[PDB]
Design a protein around this ligand. Sequence first.
Ligand SMILES: CCCCCCCCCCCCCCCCCC(=O)OC[C@H](COP(=O)([O-])OCC[N+](C)(C)C)OC(=O)CCCCCCCCCCCCCCCCC
Ligand SMILES: CCCCCCCCCCCCCCCCCC(=O)OC[C@H](COP(=O)([O-])OCC[N+](C)(C)C)OC(=O)CCCCCCCCCCCCCCCCC
Ligand SMILES: CCCCCCCCCCCCCCCCCC(=O)OC[C@H](COP(=O)([O-])OCC[N+](C)(C)C)OC(=O)CCCCCCCCCCCCCCCCC
Ligand SMILES: CCCCCCCCCCCCCCCCCCCC(=O)O[C@H](COC(=O)CCCCCCCCCCCCCC)COP(=O)(O)OCCN
Ligand SMILES: CCCCCCCCCCCCCCCCCCCC(=O)O[C@H](COC(=O)CCCCCCCCCCCCCC)COP(=O)(O)OCCN
Ligand SMILES: CCCCCCCCCCCCCCCCCCCC(=O)O[C@H](COC(=O)CCCCCCCCCCCCCC)COP(=O)(O)OCCN
Ligand SMILES: CCCCCCCCCCCCCCCCCCCC(=O)O[C@H](COC(=O)CCCCCCCCCCCCCC)COP(=O)(O)OCCN
Ligand SMILES: CCCCCCCCCCCCCCCCCC(=O)OC[C@@H](O)COP(=O)(O)OCC[N+](C)(C)C
Ligand SMILES: CC(C)CCC[C@@H](C)[C@H]1CC[C@H]2[C@@H]3CC=C4C[C@@H](O)CC[C@]4(C)[C@H]3CC[C@]12C
Ligand SMILES: *[C@@H]1O[C@H](CO)[C@@H](O)[C@H](O)[C@H]1NC(C)=O
Lengths: 203, 350, 770, 86
Amino acid sequence: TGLELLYLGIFVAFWACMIVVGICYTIFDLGFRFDVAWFLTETSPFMWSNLGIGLAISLSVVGAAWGIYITGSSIIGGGVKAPRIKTKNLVSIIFCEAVAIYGIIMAIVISNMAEPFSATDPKAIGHRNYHAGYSMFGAGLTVGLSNLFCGVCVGIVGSGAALADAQNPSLFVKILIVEIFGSAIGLFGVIVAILQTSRVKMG
Amino acid sequence: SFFPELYFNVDNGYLEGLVRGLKAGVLSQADYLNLVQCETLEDLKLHLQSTDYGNFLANEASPLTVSVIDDKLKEKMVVEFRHMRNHAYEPLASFLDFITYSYMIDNVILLITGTLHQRSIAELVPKCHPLGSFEQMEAVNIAQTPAELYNAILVDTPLAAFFQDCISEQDLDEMNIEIIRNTLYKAYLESFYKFCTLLGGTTADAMCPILEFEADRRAFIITINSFGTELSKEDRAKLFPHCGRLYPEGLAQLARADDYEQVKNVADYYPEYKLLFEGAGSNPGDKTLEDRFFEHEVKLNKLAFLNQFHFGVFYAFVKLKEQECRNIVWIAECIAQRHRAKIDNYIPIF
Amino acid sequence: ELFRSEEMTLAQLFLQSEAAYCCVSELEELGKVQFRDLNPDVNVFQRKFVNEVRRCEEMDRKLRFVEKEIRKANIPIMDTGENPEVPFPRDMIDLEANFEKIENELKEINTNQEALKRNFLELTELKFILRKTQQFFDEMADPDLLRLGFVAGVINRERIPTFERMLWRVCRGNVFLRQAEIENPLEDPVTGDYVHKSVFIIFFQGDQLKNRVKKICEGFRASLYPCPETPQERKEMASGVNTRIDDLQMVLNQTEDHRQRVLQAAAKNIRVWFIKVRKMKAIYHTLNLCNIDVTQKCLIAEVWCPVTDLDSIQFALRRGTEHSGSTVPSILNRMQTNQTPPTYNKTNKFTHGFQNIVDAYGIGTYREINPAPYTVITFPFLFAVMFGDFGHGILMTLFAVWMVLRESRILSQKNENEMFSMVFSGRYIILLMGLFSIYTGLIYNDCFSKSLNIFGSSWSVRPMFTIGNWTEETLLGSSVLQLNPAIPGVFGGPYPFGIDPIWNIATNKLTFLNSFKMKMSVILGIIHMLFGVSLSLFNHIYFKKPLNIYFGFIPEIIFMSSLFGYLVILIFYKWTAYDAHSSRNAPSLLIHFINMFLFSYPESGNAMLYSGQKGIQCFLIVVAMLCVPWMLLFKPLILRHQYLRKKHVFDFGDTMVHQAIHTIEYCLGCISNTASYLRLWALSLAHAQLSEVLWTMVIHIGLHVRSLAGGLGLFFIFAAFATLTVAILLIMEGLSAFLHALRLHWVEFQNKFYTGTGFKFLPFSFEHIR
Amino acid sequence: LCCGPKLAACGIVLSAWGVIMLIMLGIFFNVHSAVLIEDVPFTEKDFENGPQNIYNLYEQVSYNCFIAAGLYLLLGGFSFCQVRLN
Ligand SMILES: CCCCCCCCCCCCCCCCCC(=O)OC[C@H](COP(=O)([O-])OCC[N+](C)(C)C)OC(=O)CCCCCCCCCCCCCCCCC
Ligand SMILES: CCCCCCCCCCCCCCCCCC(=O)OC[C@H](COP(=O)([O-])OCC[N+](C)(C)C)OC(=O)CCCCCCCCCCCCCCCCC
Ligand SMILES: CCCCCCCCCCCCCCCCCC(=O)OC[C@H](COP(=O)([O-])OCC[N+](C)(C)C)OC(=O)CCCCCCCCCCCCCCCCC
Ligand SMILES: CCCCCCCCCCCCCCCCCCCC(=O)O[C@H](COC(=O)CCCCCCCCCCCCCC)COP(=O)(O)OCCN
Ligand SMILES: CCCCCCCCCCCCCCCCCCCC(=O)O[C@H](COC(=O)CCCCCCCCCCCCCC)COP(=O)(O)OCCN
Ligand SMILES: CCCCCCCCCCCCCCCCCCCC(=O)O[C@H](COC(=O)CCCCCCCCCCCCCC)COP(=O)(O)OCCN
Ligand SMILES: CCCCCCCCCCCCCCCCCCCC(=O)O[C@H](COC(=O)CCCCCCCCCCCCCC)COP(=O)(O)OCCN
Ligand SMILES: CCCCCCCCCCCCCCCCCC(=O)OC[C@@H](O)COP(=O)(O)OCC[N+](C)(C)C
Ligand SMILES: CC(C)CCC[C@@H](C)[C@H]1CC[C@H]2[C@@H]3CC=C4C[C@@H](O)CC[C@]4(C)[C@H]3CC[C@]12C
Ligand SMILES: *[C@@H]1O[C@H](CO)[C@@H](O)[C@H](O)[C@H]1NC(C)=O
C-alpha cells in the first residue's frame, strides 16, 4: 500500500494546509484576498471549455475501456471451455463502446459552441462568455463522469453475464436487462449535458 | 467495500473465468447417478468418458483398478491446479501456494517419519502428494539426519514460518508425528485466515466462512478422537485453530470436554453445527459426523461460487474436485467390492 | 438460392443390413444427407459397431505411423486425386493384412538396422584397435610369439590429458599407457556423433591393477573389447573382424535398400489408403447412429434432407442397392414433423466468405430473410466508406486479384498460417472491399492522402482580386487568409464527381470534411437500418405473424422514420436550400434535433429551417412517442385475450415484461445505433489523417529537397513509406474498418430483422479428402 | 547473390509499386499540379516576380522522382534476376 500511502499523505497534507490557510485568511481579516470571484473571472473561459470537451471525450473512453477489459477478460476466460461466449456476449462490449460514442457526440456538440472573444477585461468578456465556459466545463464533466460510471457498471455486469453464460446458455438473455439499465445512465448524462449547453453561446 | 469489481479482472479475470469453466465440469447429480448405475470398473470408465473427464483413463491398462483410477484423478487435478498457478500472478499465486501448503504439511510429516525410521528421503519422495512436491534440493540427500532435514525445512521450504511453533529440531524426535502435523496445520490455517482477511473484500467475505468451518470441524473431530488416547486436554487444546467461531469459550469448553455428550452440548450453542451433530447419528446405517461435516463443507464451497470478484473460487474448486475424486473412487470401490448398498454414501456436488 | 434457407424436411429410410453399408456410402458421396443419433440412450462408446470403428481407428494409427516414417525419410508422398470408396464387403481383412505387413516389416527393419549399425560400429572400433596395437608391437618383434596384464580401448580426444593424469594418480607409477590418434574421426557406439578418438593400449602388473584400470576406463566411458595375446591371434582375429565388417556393411546396404523400396511402395498409395480407411471409419461411425437389430433386422435411418434432393437421394439408394446386390430395395419416406429444421444456404464459392461473415454472429433460423446477398455489397460498401482511399484500394484490389488468380496454387499448397488462411478464404471479400474502396477514394478525391483534380476545381481565386477586396498587399499581410463564394465567380458549381480537389490544399479542409462525412455516416446508417426494418416486415409476412406486422414492424418503422429519417430529410433539405448568402442565419441541425426532442422551440437564436417546422416537428414527436405504447401495450393484450380468454402456459406479467424489454431495447437502440454509425466518419477521418501525416512525415522529406541528390534519398524514404502504408494503413486500419463494418452489420443492421437461433446444416459429406 | 524467394518477391513487388507511383508523382510534379505545392522546396525569394521559379523547382522534384523510379527499376531487375536464379 505504498502508493495509497503516498496519495493519502498528499491528500491529508493538502487539506490540512487548506484548513489552516482558511483559518488564517478569515482570522487575520485577509479574506478579501481570497477572491474566488477574481479566480473564476480572470481564469480564461477557454480553459474551462476545452477542459470540458477533453474530459467529455477522455473519461467516456476511460469508462468504455475499463468496462471492455473487465468484460473481455471474463469472456475470453470462460470461452476456453465454452467458445460460444465469444460469439454471443459481444453485446456487452458493444454497450461499453456506445458509451464512448456518446462521449464523442457530446464532445462535438460542446465544441460547436466555442468562439473567441477578442477581450480580456471581465466586463468585456461578459456573463455570456463566462457562463458559456462554465457550462461547457460542467457539461463535459457530466457526460464524461456519467459515461465513465456507466461503462464500468456495464463492464462489471457483462463480466457477470459472461461467467453465468459459460455455465447455462439461457441466462444471458435475461441478464442483458441489467446491462440495459446500466446503459441508461450514459443516456441520462448525455441528456443533461445537452440541456446544460442548450443556451450556451461564446463570442 | 474494497470495490474489487474495478481491478480484479486486470490480473485474475481470465483465471476467474477459467476456474469457473473448470467447475462447470464437476459431475452433477445426474452424472453421479449414471456412474452409480454401473456394474464394473470398465463400465465406470465408459460412463465417465461422457463427462468432462473424457479419455483420461483410456491409455491405462484394461484391467482397471481403484488405485489406478484414484491416481489418474489425482494427476488430472494436479495438472489443472498447476496450470492455474503457472498462469496466476502475485496475490493469487500466494493464495494457490497457501492451498498447496496443506499437502506440503502431510509431505513433510512423511519425510520426517521416514527419516526418523532411517529410510531414504529420495525413496520417500514418490509417496508424497504431487501438489506439495518439495522441488527444493536442500531437503534431499539429507543422509537420514533429522537435524539436517529440520535445517533444510527451515531454510528452503515455505513451512519455516509454521515450524517456529516448535522450539528446536529435537522436537521432531520428541513429539508424536500426529501432534506435529496438527500443530503445523493449526499454524497454517491461522496464517491462511490472516492472509485472506488482509486480502479483504469479496475474497475475505467468501473465504473466511470456509476457514472458520474448517477450524470448528478440526476442533470437534480432534476432541472426539482424542477421548480414549493419551493426548491430554492441555496438549489437545493447543491443536484447536483459533480461526473458528468457537474461539471465545467454545474451544475452552471443548478442551475441558471429557465425552461426546459434552462435545454435543458445546456444539448446541451454535445452530449451524447443532444440525450437523443432530444428524450425525453415528450408529450403523446413517450419516456419520464426518459425513455431515463433508456435506456442510461442500455446501460452503458451492456458496463460494455466488460471489464473483474473489479468489475463494479457486480454493472452493480445488476442494470440490477433491470431493468429486473421492466420490468417484468410492463408487469404484463399491463396484469392485459389490457393496452396492452403501453406494449412495457419496456426497453430491451441484 | 441465397434469399432464404432451403426447404428442409425429415425423412426415414428402411434399408436391409446387407446393403446398408453401400447405401450409406453412396449417401456420403452425395453429401446432401444429415443423419441423427437414434440410440442416444446408450453412449457412443458401447454401440453395435464400436468393434468395427475401433479396428478402423487402429488402421488409421498404422497409416499414421507409416506416414511418419515416410516423412522422416526423404521419400515424397504422391497425390493422384482418386477417391475410391471403402469396400463394403470384408475387404477389411485384406487391408488389415496389407497394413500389418507394411508396419511389422518397417518396425523389424528399423530394429535390425539399429542393432546392426551398433554392431558395425563396435566392430570397426575393434578393427582400428587391432591395427594400432599391431603398429605399436612393431619396434622389434624378433620372437614369433604371461604375468603382464593387457588392455586396450578408445577414448574421446582431448580426454587423453585427464585420463593419463587419473591413471598416473590412481595406479601410482605402476601402469603404462600408449596412445595414438584415429584419423578420419568415427561415430560413437551409442552417443551417436562424429567425434575424434584416440586408440590407447594399457599395460599393468597384476589383478588389483587390472581391476583398477578397468573400472577407471569404465568410469571414463571408454570401450575396451578383447585383444590378441600372440601375433598369430592378432592376425587371425583382425582378418575375422575385417571380413565381418565387410559382411555387415553389405547387409546394412541391402537392408537400407529394402527399407527404401518398401517405403517408396507405401508412399505410392499412402494417401489412397488414408482416404479409404477414413471413409470406412466415418461410414461405420454413421451406421452407429442408426437403429440396430434390437428392434428390426432392417436398418432404420433418420435424416434431414432438402425437399428438392429427395429424388437424387432415392437414386443414390438405387445405386447402393445395385452395388450391394440385394434384391429388396431400400425405401425412403417423408413424415410431418415438429423438430426445428436446420439452416442451409446453398453457399457458393463467391458467397462463401460473406455467408461465413454473416453466420459468425449466429446461424440464421430456418427460412428467414438471409442477410448474405445484401451483405455481399453492403459490407464491402461500409468498409469502403471508412477505408476510402484510391491508392490503398488499388493496392488491396491488386492483392485480392493475385489471391483470386493464384487461388488454385495456394489451395493445393496448404499451410498452417491461420491469418493467411483467413485472408485467402476471404479473398473475394477483400476484392470487393478493394473495389468499393477505390470508388469511395475517388469520391473523397483521395489517393495516398492527395486529391486528383481530374475535372477542374470549382473554386477560382482570381474573382477575389477582381471583384473582391484583395491585393498583393493583403496576400503579404495575411498568413492563411481564406476564400468566400459569396462574390460571384469564386464558386462555379459543385465538382461533378467526388469532393473538390481544392479542399486537399485548403487548411479549412477538416472544417468541411468533418460535417460532410458526419452527415454521410448518419444518412447511410439510417437508410441501412430502414432497409433492415423492411426486411423484418418481409420475415413477418413469410412467417405469418400479422400480430408482428401490425404491432412491431409498423410502429417500429413509423418511429424510426419520424425521428431519424426526418433527420436525413433535414440534412438533404439544408444542403439544397442554404447557400453562402444565407450563411449568417443558417440553422444547426444538431440544435434543431435537440429542440425537436425537447419541445424547446425558442423565439431567439437560429431561425426555423422551414415554415410550419414547429407544428410538423411536434406532430412527428407525438407520433414517435405514441409508437412506444403501440408496441408495448397492444400485442400483450391481444395475446392474453386470444390465448387465455379464448379456449378457456400463458403468463401475462411475464409477457408484459418481455414486451417492455423489447420496446425499451428497440427505442434506445434506434438512438444508439444512429450514434454508432458515426464510426464510419470516425474511421474514415482517422484513415485520412493517418495517411496525410504518414505522407508529410515520410515522403515529404524525400520530395522537399532542392538538390538533385534527393532522388537517391527518395529511394529509401519511399521504401519506408511503402512499408508503413502496408503495415499501419492497409493491414491494421484496413482490419479495423473491416471489423467495424462487420459490427455494424451484426448489430445495427441485423437487429432489425435477424434472429440467428438456428443450427448449421452439417451433412454426412466426405471432407476426409484433406 | 542467391537469397530467399520470399525476399525476392517482396523486393520485386516493392520495385513495381515504387516505379509506378514515383513515375506518376514525377509526371504530376512536371505538370505542376497545385495539389503537391507543399512538397516543392521553394523559398521566400521564389515569390518575387512570377511562377517560373516554382515551375523550375517542380521540374527538379520531378527529376528526383524519376531518378528514384529508375533506381527502383534497377532494384526490380536485380530481384527478377534473383528469382530466375531461384
Ligand atoms: C501542532 C502544529 C504546530 C503549530 C504550528 C503549525 C505551523 C504554522 C506556522 C507556519 C509558518 C508561518 C509563521 C509566520 C510567518 C509570518 C506571517 C506574517 O507575516 O504574519 C502576518 C499575518 C497577516 O497579517 P497581520 O494580520 O499581521 O496584519 C494585519 C492585517 N489586517 C490589518 C488585515 C488585520 O498575521 C500575523 O501577524 C500572524 C502572526 C502569527 C502567525 C503564526 C502562524 C499561523 C498559524 C499557526 C497554527 C494554526 C493552528 C493552531 C492550532 C494547532 C493545534 C494542533
Ligand atoms: C477537510 C474537508 C474540508 C473542510 C475544511 C476546509 C474547508 C476550506 C478549505 C479551502 C481553503 C480555505 C477556505 C477559506 C478561505 C478564507 C475565506 C475568507 O477569508 O473569507 C471568509 C468570509 C469573508 O471574510 P471577510 O473578512 O470578508 O468577513 C466579512 C466582512 N464583511 C461582511 C464586512 C465583508 O467569511 C467567513 O468567515 C466564511 C467562513 C469560511 C472561512 C473559514 C474556513 C474554515 C476552514 C475550516 C476550519 C474551521 C474551524 C473549526 C475547526 C473544526 C471544524 C469542525
Ligand atoms: C499488401 C496488403 C494488402 C491488404 C490486404 C489485407 C487487408 C486488411 C484486412 C484483411 C482482413 C482479413 C479478415 C477477413 C477474412 C476472413 C473472413 C472469411 O471469409 O473467412 C471466414 C472465417 C474463416 O473461415 P472458416 O475456416 O470459418 O471457413 C468455413 C469453414 N467451415 C464451414 C468448415 C467451418 O470464418 C469465421 O470464423 C468468420 C469470422 C471472421 C471474422 C474475421 C476476424 C478478423 C481476422 C483477422 C485476420 C488476420 C489479420 C491480418 C493479418 C495479415 C498479416 C498476415
Ligand atoms: C504519512 C506520513 C506523513 C506524510 C506527509 C508527506 C506527504 C506524503 C509523502 C509520502 C509519505 C509516506 C512515504 C511513502 C513513500 C512513497 C510511496 C511508497 C514508495 C513508492 O513510491 O514506491 C512504490 C511506487 O513507486 C514509486 O516510487 C513511484 C512514486 C513516484 C510517483 C510520483 C507522482 C505523483 C505526484 C503527486 C501528485 C498526484 C496526487 C494524487 C492524489 C510503491 O511501492 P508499493 O506500494 O508497490 O510496494 C510496497 C512498498 N513500496
Ligand atoms: C467545517 C468546514 C468548513 C465549512 C465552511 C465553508 C468553506 C467553503 C470554502 C470556500 C471559501 C469560503 C467561502 C467564503 C469566502 C468567499 C470569498 C470572500 C472574499 C471576497 O471578498 O471576495 C469577493 C468575491 O467573492 C465571491 O463573490 C465568491 C462567491 C463564492 C464563494 C464560495 C465559493 C467556494 C467554492 C465552492 C465550490 C464548490 C464546488 C462543488 C463541486 C470580492 O468580490 P467583489 O465583487 O467585492 O470584488 C471587488 C473587486 N473590485
Ligand atoms: C472501381 C469502381 C467500381 C466499384 C463498384 C463496383 C464493384 C463490383 C464488385 C463485383 C465485381 C466482382 C465479382 C466477382 C468476380 C469473381 C467471380 C467469382 C466466381 C463467380 O463467377 O461468382 C459467381 C457469383 O457472381 C459473380 O461473380 C458476380 C458477377 C457479376 C456481378 C455484377 C455486379 C457488378 C457491380 C455493379 C456493376 C458495375 C458497377 C461499376 C462500374 C458464382 O460463383 P461461380 O459459379 O463462379 O462459383 C464456382 C464454384 N461454385
Ligand atoms: C421505408 C421508408 C420510411 C420513410 C423514410 C423517410 C423518412 C420520413 C420522415 C417523416 C415523413 C416525411 C418528412 C415530414 C417532415 C417535414 C419534411 C420537411 C422537409 C423540408 O425541409 O421541406 C421544406 C418544407 O416544405 C414546405 O414548405 C411544405 C410544408 C412542410 C412540409 C409538408 C410535408 C411534406 C412531407 C410529406 C410526407 C412525406 C412522407 C415520406 C415518407 C421545403 O419547403 P421550402 O424550402 O420551399 O419552404 C421554405 C420556406 N417556406
Ligand atoms: C503496387 C501497385 C501500384 C500502386 C499504384 C498507386 C498509384 C499512385 C499514383 C499517385 C500517387 C501520388 C498522388 C498525387 C495526386 C496529385 C496529382 C494531380 O493533381 O493530378 C492532376 C494534375 O496533374 C493536374 O492538375 P493541376 O495541374 O493542379 O490542374 C490542371 C488540371 N485540369 C487541366 C484538369 C484543370
Ligand atoms: C509541505 C506541505 C504541507 C506544504 C507546506 C505548507 C505551506 C502552505 C506553508 C509553509 C510555509 C508557509 C509560508 C511561511 C511564511 C510566509 C510569510 C508570509 O508573509 C506570507 C506567507 C508565507 C510565504 C507562508 C505561506 C504558506 C507556506 C508556504
Ligand atoms: C471591400 O471588401 C469587402 C469585404 O470583403 C467586399 O465586400 C467589398 O466588395 C470590397 N470593396 C471594393 C473592392 O470596392
